[PDB]
Amino acid sequence: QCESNPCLNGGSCKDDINSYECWCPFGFEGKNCEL
C-alpha cells in the first residue's frame, strides 16, 4: 500500500514520481501539507 497523497493534485499516493507541485486543502502548508 501507499499513504494517501495529502495534496489535491497529482497521483493518489504521497510522493508521486510524476508530480512536482503540491496544492494543500485550505488551512494547511508545506510539501506534505503539515502546518
Partner 1 sequence: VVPVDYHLLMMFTKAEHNAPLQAKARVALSSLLRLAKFEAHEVLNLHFVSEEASREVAKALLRELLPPAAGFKCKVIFHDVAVLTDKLFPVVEAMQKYFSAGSGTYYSDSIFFLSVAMHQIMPKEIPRIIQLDLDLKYKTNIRELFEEFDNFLPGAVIGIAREMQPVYRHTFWQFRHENPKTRVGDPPPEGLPGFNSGVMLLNLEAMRQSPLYSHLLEPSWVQQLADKYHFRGHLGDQDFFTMIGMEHPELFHVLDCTWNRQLCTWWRDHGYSDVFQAYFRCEGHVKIYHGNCNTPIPE
Ligand X SMILES: *[C@@H]1O[C@H](CO)[C@@H](O)[C@H](O[C@H]2OC[C@@H](O)[C@H](O)[C@H]2O)[C@H]1O
Q: Per the annotation, where are the binding residues for Ca(2+)?
A: 1, 15-16
Query: Could you give the string, one character per residue 1-35, with x where binding to partner 1 holds by CB under 8 A and - elsewhere?
Result: xx-x-x-xx-xxx--xxx-----xxxxx----x--
Determine the size of the site formed for ligand X (CB under 6 A): 2
Q: How far apart are CA 19 and CA 24, in angstroms?
A: 14
**Smallest gap, in angstroms, from Cβ of residue 3 to ligand X?**
4
Which residues inside 1-35 make contact with ligand X, applying CB under 6 A? 3-4
What is the DSSP secondary structure assignment for residue 8, as one 8-state letter? Answer: S
* Residue in the block written with cell 508545506: 30
Neighbours of 22 (CB within 10 A): 19
